[PDB]
Structures are given as structure tokens and as C-alpha cells.
């Protein structure tokens, strides 16, 4: 009956939660049949002179120190709801959410003549929102904000958990100008200023340790059902789909779930853009990513979930879905099969390299485990995610890895060394908040010496 159009409205809610208005309207009229056949083929485009804003929550750790696993979910939802209110006011598009971070772009589907204007004003609104939530909730944390402009190729990648995203050097530049941004004020560059018209409270905001400034202010329903249910299982998993299906939100505390990051290191050196838009190199990237996704389809690959794809990264976790402690299953084999997934995806990138003409794409992988918190953010939108110590621990770990070498946390090293895998000690690395930390590697003398 009309339950069919109800389901269509649900699928609209899904799509507009993974892709902005322009491309979502372009695909909801099903332009080409191959694209919809895929949704059960895509287009990627490179746009120039766009504005990219990042914002990280300063000191998230203690602000998330001793919660009951619920309050952080709700407060973060409040923040992001205010933030997207701000976006829809400023007509700028949110893109994704990395833990302590949140970020937007300006004029990528349609470029606007004063995009960076809207972007920095959105940043000012962010500052006001965070200060007001601070004085409201009595939670003493603010946000570092780094803005940049340039040119980026945007599109989608992967078929699992695929999300409309952006890639270029500008990504790295904005990410660092955040990581080098100042608490509470926006870290800008001439790429912003070169069309700014000095209408603000500019300062020569540089590092105290490239034209960098600061601003501080001034009967087909079953066809439709398979399609929409698959999109749901795309963006969020099954158990959480049920737990919220009968409720409003979700929040969970998993005291032990392993997380591994895998980043393609030698990609940037191959990116060279003397070709128009470099989009084919990233098409090859999508081939590799989709292979990584297809890996998941193994039956012994059930307890593993791909959290998301961070830029060119590949975030994979486990130990979250099967709540049942089985007497016919050892409660610690999930990490074993996770590391086996890691070895086998190394095998897969090897195979992809057999076919990659006169070039090797190598990847560095980082491992961690321990307590963490899973949650779902959006409402009228959607986003699944996780936080805690383990996540940014593994991030900072794999950030200091060498390709084809499995960087592993010391305690995970201990618990895995009794699982039979042989390791060589890499050293002891300084960690923010934790200091020196001993790291290990799985490959046993893979080099000449």
C-alpha cells in the first residue's frame, strides 16, 4: 500500500544521512541504472577553491573520564545538534565525525562566491556554542579550530560503510592546522586570507616553535525493503539497529574491544596530479578499499565491524556485537581472529600489489584493545562511532608506524604473545597522557637485517 512510500521516506532519511542535498537529489531520481544497481558505479569530482573547517574537542579525555557510558553520548549529541543548526544556517555541509573531532566543508557540491566567509563565521558560531555549553553544563572544555582552503576531490569510497568524503593535500593541511590550532580561536592561512578583505580581528597567528594567521572574533515493497534495510545495515549494525529500533538513542560500554588502523603510507608520493583531477588514482584507491570491504564477507569474519574510513584510512574493530559469552567459545579468540584478519588483509594488499603496475602501496597498521564506549550520534541523521582511551591510543600509535609492520600495544603484546604469535620489540614511544609506551611488531626479520 502506502507503507511503500513510508519506506521510501525512510530510505530518504538514510541517504540524506550519508550524502548531501545535491548528490542525494541527483541519485534519488536514479539518473543511471548502474548507480542504483550498485546501491542495492558512482561518480567522483574534484572541485577547486573550497573551504574546509576542522574542530577537535580539547582535553576530551578527562571530560570523558568517569562517566556512566551514557552522559557523554547525550552531551555530544547536543553539541553536534547545535553545530548542524549552525551549518544549516551558514549553508555549509557537515562531512563526518572523528571521535574528539567534527568538521565541515563549504561549497564543494556548488561553490559559493563567499564560502570561506560562511566557514569562518560558522567557526565563530562554534566558539559561541562551545562557550555557552561550557557555562551551561559546567563542563570545562572548549574546541580547537583549524580552517583551510584550496582544492579537493570529493566523492565516495568503498561499498561497506561508504560515506561521502573528500581527499587532497588540503585534507592534511586542514588537519594539521587543527592539530596546530589554538584552543578557542581559529587557525587560518593565507589560503583563507587571500580573499578575506580584512573584515575581522586578524592576528599574525603562527607557530611559536607558511603565511599563517589567527582569528579570535570580529508488489515492489520487498524490493524497496531489501534496499532500505541494506542501507540501514550499511550505516549502523544489527544489534544497535534493534536497540534503537525500540528506543530513541543508544550507548554502550565495552570494556574490551580491539581496534586496528591501517593507513596507505606511500599513496601521497604517488598522488602526483599532472593528470586532470587525479580522480583515476583515487578510483584505484576505491578498488583497493572495496577489496578490503569484500574481505569482511568471510563467515569467520562475523565479529569484526568496519567502523568507518577516515580519509584514506581503514578503521576496523571487534568485540562489540556478540554480547553472549559462549561456553563453547573462548572469550579472547575474537582478538586472535582480528589479528588473522590483519594478516590476511596484508595478504590482500600484497595481491593488489601484484597487479599494481610498477608501484607498491604499503600500509602501516596499529593495534590496541581495552575499554571503550560505542554510541550512535545522529537523529534525523545517523552516525555510529566509538570513543574512549583505546581509540585515540591506537590512532597515535599507528600514526608512528612503519609500513608492513604491525605496531601493537604493550599489553595487547602481552596477551597475544601467549597466543603464539612471534614479535620483535620496536622500542618505547612517548604517548600523550601516558608517556613512554613499549611497542612491538609481528614481522620477524622481514627485511635484510
Amino acid at each position: 500500500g502506502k507503507d511503500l512510500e513510508v519506506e521510501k521516506a525512510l530510505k530518504e532519511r538514510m541517504i540524506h544521512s550519508v550524502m548531501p542535498r545535491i548528490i542525494a537529489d541527483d541519485l534519488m531520481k536514479q539518473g543511471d541504472e548502474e548507480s542504483e544497481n550498485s546501491v542495492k558505479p558512482f561518480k567522483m569530482q574534484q572541485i577547486e577553491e573550497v573551504s574546509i573547517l576542522f574542530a577537535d574537542i580539547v582535553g576530551f579525555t578527562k571530560m570523558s573520564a568517569n562517566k556512566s557510558a551514557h552522559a557523554l553520548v547525550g552531551l555530544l549529541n547536543d553539541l553536534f545538534g547545535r553545530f548542524d543548526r549552525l551549518c544549516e544556517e551558514t549553508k555549509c555541509e557537515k562531512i563526518s565525525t572523528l571521535g574528539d573531532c567534527y568538521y565541515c566543508v563549504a561549497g564543494c557540491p556548488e561553490p559559493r562566491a563567499d564560502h570561506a566567509y560562511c566557514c569562518i563565521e560558522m567557526g565563530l558560531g562554534m566558539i559561541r556554542a562551545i562557550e555557552q555549553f561550557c557555562q551551561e553544563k559546567k563542563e570545562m572544555v572548549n574546541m580547537r579550530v583549524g580552517v583551510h582552503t584550496g582544492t579537493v576531490l570529493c566523492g565516495i569510497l568503498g561499498m561497506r560503510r561508504f560515506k561521502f568524503d573528500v581527499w587532497s593535500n588540503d585534507v592534511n593541511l586542514a588537519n594539521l592546522m587543527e592539530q596546530l590550532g589554538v584552543a578557542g580561536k581559529v587557525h587560518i592561512s593565507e589560503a583563507t586570507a587571500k580573499y578575506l578583505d580584512d573584515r575581522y580581528e586578524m592576528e599574525d597567528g603562527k607557530v611559536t616553535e607558511l603565511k599563517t594567521y589567527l582569528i579570535a572574533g570580529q508488489t515492489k515493497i520487498q524490493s524497496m525493503r531489501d534496499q532500505a534495510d541494506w542501507l540501514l545495515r550499511n550505516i549502523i549494525p544489527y544489534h544497535v539497529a534493534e536497540q534503537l529500533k525500540v528506543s530513541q538513542t543508544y550507548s554502550k560500554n565495552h570494556d574490551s574491544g580491539g581496534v586496528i588502523f591501517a593507513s596507505i603510507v606511500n599513496f601521497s608520493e604517488f598522488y602526483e596530479e599532472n593528470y586532470e583531477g587525479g580522480k583515476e588514482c583515487y578510483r584505484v584507491l576505491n578498488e583497493l578499499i572495496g577489496d578490503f570491504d569484500e574481505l569482511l564477507s568471510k563467515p569467520d569474519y562475523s565479529s569484526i565491524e568496519k567502523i568507518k574510513t577516515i580519509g584514506a584510512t581503514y578503521m576496523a574493530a571487534s568485540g562489540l556485537n556478540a554480547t553472549q559469552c559462549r561456553d563453547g567459545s573462548h572469550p579472547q579468540e575474537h582478538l586472535q581472529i582480528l589479528f588473522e584478519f590483519a594478516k590476511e588483509m596484508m595478504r590482500v594488499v600484497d595481491d593488489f600489489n601484484n597487479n599494481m603496475l610498477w608501484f607498491n602501496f604499503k600500509l602501516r597498521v596499529g593495534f590496541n584493545h581495552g575499554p571503550l564506549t560505542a554510541g550512535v550520534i545522529g537523529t534525523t541523521k545517523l552516525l555510529y562511532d566509538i570513543w574512549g582511551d583505546t581509540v585515540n591510543i591506537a590512532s597515535r600509535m599507528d600514526t608512528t608506524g612503519v609500513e608492513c609492520r604491525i605496531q601493537v600495544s604493550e599489553e595487547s603484546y602481552r596477551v597475544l604473545s601467549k597466543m603464539g604469535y612471534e614479535f620483535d620489540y620496536r622500542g618505547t614511544v612517548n604517548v600523550k597522557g601516558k608517556g613512554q609506551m613499549k611497542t612491538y611488531l609481528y614481522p620477524k626479520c622481514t627485511d635484510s637485517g
Partner: protein, 128 residues
């Protein structure tokens, strides 16, 4: 074709360079233009590993002269990015297309250029 494994071992020999195996395969009717998943043809794996002799046999076997991988690069473009002067010349003999360009929009002469390879650069300079 009907059970296209002949072309599979064809490609794997082209990458390995086992002459006699290629000979037996073609004598058994291995499809001289069967490709792998990524659009790579046996001429491509040949140009890669520098098995000029198997290149010769395969052109004798009637392989495509302008077959393009998924990235549009012909084995002409391959050797041009490589620098196997012999295979470059022998492909020029068999009718390689000179003014084409892969989906990167670049002519293989510019590939030899980015190699810093003046050899193949000059080699393609003399054609038209």
C-alpha cells in the same frame, strides 16, 4: 572463452617469462588476447618483466597492439614508463599508436620523460 583458464596461465607465464610454456599454451589455443581482471593483457606482463622473446612470439601470435589496461595504459605505455628500449622498438615495428594517451591524458613519450629516460624519448621523437 569456454573455460578461460588458458588465458590465465598465459598471463602468468607472461609475467613469469616461461617461453616454452607460452609456446605450449598457444599451440593449445590459448586466447592471444585474454586479459586478467584489471585489463592487463599478456603483452603488459611481458613489457613489465622484459621478456622480449615472448613479446616477439605473442606479436607473432597476433596479440592486440593497443590493448589498454583498466588504467587505459597500453603495454606501449608500460614499456615507455619502463625503458626496455628493445621492446619499445619492436612494438614500434608492429604498429604501436603514437598520438594516443591513457585515461591520464598523457602520451607514453611523457612517460619516458618522467622516467628521466632520454632513450625512449628520442626513440618516439623520430616517429609521426
Amino acid at each position: 572463452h569456454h573455460g578461460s583458464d588458458l588465458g590465465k596461465k598465459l598471463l602468468e607465464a607472461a609475467r613469469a617469462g616461461q617461453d616454452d610454456e607460452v609456446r605450449i599454451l598457444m599451440a593449445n589455443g590459448a586466447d592471444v588476447n585474454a586479459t586478467d581482471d584489471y585489463g592487463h593483457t599478456p603483452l603488459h606482463l611481458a613489457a613489465w618483466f622484459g621478456h622480449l622473446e615472448i613479446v616477439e612470439v605473442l606479436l607473432k601470435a597476433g596479440a592486440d597492439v593497443n590493448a589498454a589496461d583498466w588504467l587505459g595504459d597500453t603495454p606501449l605505455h608500460l614499456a615507455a614508463r619502463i625503458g626496455h628500449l628493445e621492446i619499445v622498438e619492436v612494438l614500434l615495428k608492429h604498429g604501436a599508436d603514437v598520438n594516443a594517451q591513457d585515461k591520464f591524458g598523457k602520451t607514453p613519450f611523457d612517460l619516458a620523460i618522467d622516467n628521466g629516460n632520454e632513450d625512449i624519448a628520442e626513440v618516439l621523437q623520430k616517429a609521426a
